[PDB]
Amino acid sequence: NTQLSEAHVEKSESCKTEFASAYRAHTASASAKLRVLYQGNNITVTAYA
Amino acid sequence: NVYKATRPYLAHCPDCGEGHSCHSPVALERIRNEATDGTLKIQVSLQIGIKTDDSHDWTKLRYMDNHMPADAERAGLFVRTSAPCTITGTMGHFILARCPKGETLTVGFTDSRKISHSCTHPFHHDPPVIGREKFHSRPQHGKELPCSTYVQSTAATTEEIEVHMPPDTPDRTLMSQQSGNVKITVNGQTVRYKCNCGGSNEGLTTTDKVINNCKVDQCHAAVTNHKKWQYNSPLVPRNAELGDRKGKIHIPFPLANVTCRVPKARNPTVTYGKNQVIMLLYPDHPTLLSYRNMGEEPNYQEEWVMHKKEVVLTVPTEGLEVTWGNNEPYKYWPQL
Amino acid sequence: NVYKATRPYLAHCPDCGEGHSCHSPVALERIRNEATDGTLKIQVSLQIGIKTDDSHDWTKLRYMDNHMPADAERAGLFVRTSAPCTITGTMGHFILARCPKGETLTVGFTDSRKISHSCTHPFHHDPPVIGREKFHSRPQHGKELPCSTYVQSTAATTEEIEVHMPPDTPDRTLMSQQSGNVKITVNGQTVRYKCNCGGSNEGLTTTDKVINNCKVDQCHAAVTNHKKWQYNSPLVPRNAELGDRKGKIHIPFPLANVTCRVPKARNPTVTYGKNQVIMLLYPDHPTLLSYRNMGEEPNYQEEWVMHKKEVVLTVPTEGLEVTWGNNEPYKYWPQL
Structure with a gap:
């Protein structure tokens, strides 16, 4: 008598929920928030640096 | 009712x-x-x-x-x-x-x-352990942290198991050594038999059969019922007259990311000194203590506090940030 | 029978x-x-x-x-x-x-x-833990040490607690949807109600009340207690029509100083040498080993022995005193 034992590796059902992403960071874009006391009143300025 | 073809x-x-x-x-x-x-x-x-x-x-x-x-x-x-x-x-x-x-x-x-x-x-x-506190009873209201659990939705979606046919269920209790012969007790069931000895050594019987001049070990029987389905179990043998013929059924209780409410370590007895900070840590469960400088050289240090401990940490001009468990980081500044 | 007035x-x-x-x-x-x-x-x-x-x-x-x-x-x-x-x-x-x-x-x-x-x-x-040995089972005969326990005397003496009446309690079974109106069934109790709908939407009722054109989910009420007594617990509300009116009852199992027993450890295999003593310690449970010199400089050293251990201790001219668990301290001197 003989016994055939076959196996293979697949992605688990959890891979859609429990996973870690491997990214390659290139360049970065800066964006901001400055308070200015202009004419006795505080003004909010949000712009790219 | 997927349980029509399914069985135990x-x-x-x-x-x-x-x-x-x-x-x-x-x-x-x-x-x-x-x-x-x-x-x-x-x-x-x-x-x-x-x-x-x-x-x-x-x-x-x-x-x-x-x-x-x-x-x-x-x-x-x-x-x-x-x-x-x-x-x-x-x-x-x-x-x-x-x-x-x-x-x-x-x-x-x-x-x-x-x-x-x-x-x-x-x-x-x-x-x-979820969080930084080893509690026993879960709180109704607390800190929101990401975790995972098995939901109670019975709906046929996501996960699935492989189910195959249970050809003939093997049963050694069907054969009996009648002196020097083998008796096959059917008990109102369809039985498929095979023997090493001469004469009748194959077939599908509905009646009680007797094999003359044979041993129980040189025989094999099993009930038939190729009408029900079975799950691909490694604790059950594979169907002889079948290769890799199998079916599949959706399974309940899938894994899904949810939110868990944990607790926070109690604030320690804090006393200030000349460019130094003293903390009297009283942990109920193993709590992690971490500290870093808010300048050029951070010099990160980590330790698991379990017993009553007194810690003296030097505070530089740039500042010292101390994190005690799941609590928000405490900022300290010297001067002058 | 102090339990006549008391309750739950x-x-x-x-x-x-x-x-x-x-x-x-x-x-x-x-x-x-x-x-x-x-x-x-x-x-x-x-x-x-x-x-x-x-x-x-x-x-x-x-x-x-x-x-x-x-x-x-x-x-x-x-x-x-x-x-x-x-x-x-x-x-x-x-x-x-x-x-x-x-x-x-x-x-x-x-x-x-x-x-x-x-x-x-x-x-x-x-x-x-009491003493210097971490044992599990308690010995019938051993070293007498001072400790404390709660005695089994039921007698009304020493310690006491506080008792009173119940406070405001919530109850959704007090409201009922009478067609398109809400009926508040008092049942001989003082009930505090509040609703989102117009007209009467607040008060402390002693009689059965009906709120016209409202839903049960848009309302809510409570109740009060009295008669029967009760212990002043922080998990139960205080009685509305009452200030600091309270009673007191003597409680069983008071704390008292007793005496704890700690069996003695078995003698160790002792072998003498040139100004030194060798001990083969075989502890059944955590046993404390302590030693000191009988001169000007005692130099006390303590250690909890748990496993099979061999200890070499130097014996000076003045003498060496070794205490092994609850046994009477041992004395050793250098032979002339």
Whole structure:
């Protein structure tokens, strides 16, 4: 008598929920928030640096 | 009703009690521990919430008892590691349970004849504490942290198991050594037999048969019923007149990311000094203490505080940030 | 029978089962562990040894069941940490129990309708160590050391508590949807109501009230207590038509200083050498080893011996005194 034992590796059902992403960071874009006391009143300025 | 073609069965166990291996109707298959909250998805040999006549009854259990399936009680079912476990869901082969720290998982039940059968498997149980506090009772309102659990949606989606046909169920209890001959006791069932000895050595019998001048070991029988379906179990043999012919069915209780409410370590007794900070740490459970400088050289240091401890930390001109468990980082600044 | 006026009550719980918080009639208040012997003084929401008609019956239990107090069984009551605890006294809100090493305390019971309710609180239980040896089983004869425990004298002396009446209690069973209006059924009780709808939407009613054109979800009310007495618990509200009017009752199991016993360790294999002493220590349980010089500089050294150990100690001209557990300190001197 003989016994055939076959196996293979697949992605688990959890891979859609429990996973870690491997990214390659290139360049970065800066964006901001400055308070200015202009004419006795505080003004909010949000712009790219 | 996917349970029309589905059915129960039996398997083998490595520990039925006192370290002795046997063929248990409560045999363990797969013990899933993907849930971050601590919930265990246990796959068993028997079926829960279904009766022998194929009907839904939550107080009833369906197990295999020597060639024929029999009914049992839901209250008799138990799960344990080192101490008993709280059952939080039962449907078919699946059991949901929250277990304390253990090295071996035990799943058992009680039959109609008042006999208890239990299967023990070596499994290292040790859920990863959620947060920074080791509490026992869960709070109704607290800090929101990301975790995972098995939902109670019965809906046929996501996860699936492989189910195959149970050709003929092997049964050695069908053969008997009648002096120097072999008697095959049918008991109103269709039996497929095969023997090494001469004369009649093959066939599908509906009546009681006798093989002249033969031994029980040189024979083999089994009941037929290629009408029901079975799950691909490694504890049950593969169908002889079949290659890789199999079916598949959607399974309940999938894993899904949710939110858990944890606690926060109590604030320590803080006393200030000349460019230094003194903390009297009183932890109820193992709490992590980490600190860094808010300048050019951060010099990160980490330590697990368990007992009553006094820590003296130097505060530079740039500032010192101290994180005590799950609490928000405490900022300190000297001067002058 | 001080239990004539006394009774039970209801409160909130953090863990009612499976980590879910609810309003439990077996709610935990205060868990006292002042006794050095290991006895725990547990304060609960219900009352034990008293019936609903205010009568003493040791086999009966009095718990709160949806606005009205109901009777239960004493045999159904249970206390557990990691394993079940032995109950050594029950009277009113108080339970005396000896518990093994645990991290969470659980107190439960079984009602008339055969439904079990249990409250779980995170509590670090672990009897302190006395002496210099960490043993498990207590010896019948050993070294006498001063300690403290809770005595079993029921006699009304020393310690006492405070009692009074109940406070504002919530109840949704007080409201009912009468077609398109809301009816508030008082049942001879003072009820405080509030609704979202127009007209009368506040007040303290003693009579049956009806709110025209409103829904049950848009309303809410409570109630008050009186007559029967009650213990001043922080888990139960204070009586509305009452300031600081309260009574007091003497409590059993007072703390007293006793004497603890600690058997003696078996002699070690002693071999002498040139100005040195060799000891082969074989401890059955954690045994404390201490040694000092009998001269100007004593140089005291202490260590807890648990495994098989060989110790080499230098003996000076003045002498060396070695104490091995509860045995009488040993003396050694250099032979001329």
